[PDB]
Structure formats: C-alpha cells, structure tokens
Design a binder for this molecule. Structure first.
Ligand code: 3UK
Length: 384
C-alpha cells in the first residue's frame, strides 16, 4: 500500500475551503482557517514530538481540540481524547497505558501543557513559549502505512487503535452510504469527542463530507441543548434515547430544524420512536462500538422501524454465535453479535492475551445479544 497521512488525506478532499467546518460560541471557522492553524501548530508539534509519540488530550469540546488532534496526526503523533474531568489517577493510568509523551489539559491543572483561560476561539496551548513561533508554510506530513495506528480511543479502560484505512472506512459507511451527508449540512452531536460516537460526528464528518459541526465546551443540560438547537438549527442531530426523551416538551422547536435525527449508545425504546413518529420525526437507531470505529448496524433513513437496530451497513458483515460458538442461521434466536467490516480496529494498543481475544479471528466480539428477523434486521436482546 502507498504511505499516507490521515490529516493530509482529509485536507485533499474536494470541498470548498471557504465553507464552515466548526462552530463555537457563536463564531464560525472555515475549512481554510482551521487548515492554516493546523499546519502552523503542526510545525510546532514537530519540534517537540517524534513520529509515533502518544498525546493525551483531556479537553472540553472546542475547535482548538479538534485542530490540535489533527495537528498531532499530521506530524505522526498518536493522540487520544479523554474526559477532561477525569480523576487524577484515571488520567495518569491512561497516560501510563499509552506511555504518552505529552498531556494537554484545561487551565490550572509526562510533559503537561495547559489550555488558556477565557475559552478563545483558537488556542496555542503555550507552544509559542515552549518551542517558538510557527513556520509559515508547513507541509511536512508524516506518511505511514494506512493500516498503522493513527490515534487511540479509550473505552479497565483499553486503548482502541484506529488507522487511516479503517477511519475513512467507518466514515464512508456511515456519513456517505447511510446518511448521505451533503456539503453545507449542519451537524450537532450531544455526545462529546472523548466518546467514539462524538469524535466521528463532530471531529471527522465535517472534514469528510463537507459538513459543519457545532462544538460546545459546556455540559449538555437539556436547557443548553435547546439553546443550541434554536441558535444553530442543525439538519442532523446525533443523540441518544434519553436525550430525545428530554426533548419531548420542545418537540415544536426540534422539528422546526432537525430533519435527520439519529440515536446511538443504547436501544431506542419503541415508545420514544412512536412518540416522535406521531409528531413526524423519524429517529434512526444505530449501534456502534469503539472497536468498530463508528455505527456499523442501523436503521436506514426513511426506512426505520420501532424496536429494531436495522441492517448492517454496506461493507459490514454481522454474525450471531450461540453458547457453543456455532453460527446461528435461524431468525428469532438470540446469540452474541460478532462484526467485521470497514471500521474494524486493528486491535488494542496495549492489552493482555484475554483482552485482545475480543478481536479473535478477524471479528470484534461485541458482547451484545441480538436476534435476526425473517428480513435480516437485527434487534438488541441484552448482554452476555
Ligand atoms: N463508539 C461508538 C461509535 C458510534 C456509536 C456508538 C458508539 C458506542 O456506544 O461505543 P462504546 O464502545 O462506548 O459502546 C458500544 C456498546 O454500546 C452499546 N450500544 C451502542 N449503541 C447501541 C444501540 N444503538 N443499541 C444498543 N446497544 C448499543 C452496545 O452494548 C455496544 O456493544
């Protein structure tokens, strides 16, 4: 295969550079603005990090987080985004697990750097003081095997490795094949970027499909969410079942903007589906897993059904194994869901033999019990 770099590949996708990519605190950044900032920042990270060094980013959602993440990748570093409110020992355990060279935290608290106070639109994270001002026209991307580890996603937390190949893989299946996101689409993800679901929705899909995403550094209280819906008016809403439960009293405001409502994280109850169907809003339930990059099995827009997880996305293969390890062919018979496909991770960054056994045989063992109906659609039935 030909060596490549995930940030460079995204930067080369054919979309208008003057269009929005990120929105933050009432401001908007274009693809061009972030691209310029990412290259400048990369020129500084290259003075600090050698290719392969790990970086832990314990930051609230913001354009600077997304861009710093892409700047790490540009120079060949391997970033991980974790909950900024992690306990001290939890942050330490993660940095030790990936042997990180650099941790970047919020203000006031490996080498540790801090964001500025005041929530600026763009942040230098003290790099100007640490390594000096940026180069003007940096482009020294670190290109590598497309199957090699590019960044980590931690889900005892284990670090899931994601590569250039399977990242573009899960983007294609979900953003393109399932949702058919169009350039200019406005996206709003309630889950944050330290969640695999949020990282895809907010960080990657804007670059991948020419869309733009609202980023919010505050926690998603239902009143904060409602504010954002009316200020931003997204076409696509990435939610979870409890969120839609909390949005019932505001159905009018929701349907005024949201045209594609997605739900992931846990099974969407039939009651929630039918309530919003009665109001004329289709909630598409889909399942993803960190070890699979993003959503791999979902209700297709315009064809969703209640109490169902839908059909495997294009390119994915789903299998059900019974308690003796045999593949289940019959419908209405529960088994453990195994999955392979474009988004499948190459494995955990650091793990025991038993931990890596989740990836045994070229499949990811979800640990979810599922059943298939006569048409091939899946239905969540609990955990093993
Ligand atoms: N990482 C993700 C990327 C995209 C979208 C979600 C995720 C995500 O949740 O990743 P995680 O690794 O935290 O958890 C995966 C596990 O969560 C459960 N689950 C998620 N979605 C559903 C659903 N629709 N219906 C039923 N169960 C679901 C299921 O137990 C699964 O094994």
């Amino acid at each position: 295969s030909t060596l490549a770099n995930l940030t460079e590949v995204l930067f080369r996708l054919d979309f208008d550079p003057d269009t929005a990519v990120y929105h933050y605190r009432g401001q908007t950044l274009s693809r061009l603005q972030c691209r310029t900032y990412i290259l400048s920042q990369a020129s500084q990270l290259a003075r600090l990090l050698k290719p392969g060094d790990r970086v832990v980013l314990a930051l609230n959602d913001s354009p600077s987080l997304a861009c710093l993440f892409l700047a790490c990748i540009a120079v060949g570093a391997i970033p991980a985004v974790i909950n900024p409110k992690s306990r001290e020992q939890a942050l330490a355990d993660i940095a030790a697990d990936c042997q990180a060279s650099l941790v970047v935290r919020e203000a006031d608290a490996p080498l540790t750097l801090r964001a500025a106070a005041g929530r600026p639109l763009l942040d230098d994270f003290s790099l100007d003081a640490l390594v000096g001002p940026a180069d003007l026209d940096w482009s020294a991307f670190h290109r590598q095997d497309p199957a090699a580890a590019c960044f980590l996603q931690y889900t005892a937390p284990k670090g899931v490795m994601h590569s250039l190949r399977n990242t573009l893989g899960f983007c294609r299946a979900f953003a393109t094949e399932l949702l058919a996101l169009q350039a200019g689409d406005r996206l709003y993800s309630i889950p944050k970027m330290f969640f695999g679901y949020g990282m895809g929705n907010s960080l990657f899909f804007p670059w991948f499909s020419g869309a733009s995403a609202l980023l919010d550094d505050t926690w998603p209280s239902p009143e904060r969410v409602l504010e954002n819906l009316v200020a931003f008016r997204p076409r696509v809403l990435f939610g979870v079942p409890a969120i839609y439960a909390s949005l019932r009293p505001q159905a009018r405001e929701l349907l005024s903007s949201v045209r594609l409502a997605f739900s992931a994280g846990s099974p969407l109850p039939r009651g929630e589906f039918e309530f919003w169907a009665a109001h004329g809003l289709e909630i598409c339930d889909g399942i993803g897993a960190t070890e699979v990059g993003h959503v791999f099995l979902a209700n297709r827009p315009g064809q969703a059904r209640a109490d169902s997880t839908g059909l495997p996305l294009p390119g994915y293969e789903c299998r059900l194994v019974d308690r003796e390890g045999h593949t289940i062919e019959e419908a209405g018979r529960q088994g453990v869901l195994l999955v392979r496909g474009p988004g499948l991770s190459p494995g955990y960054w650091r793990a025991s033999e038993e931990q890596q056994a989740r990836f045994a045989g070229g499949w990811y063992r979800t640990g979810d019990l599922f059943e298939r109906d006569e048409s091939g659609a899946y239905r969540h039935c609990g955990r093993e």
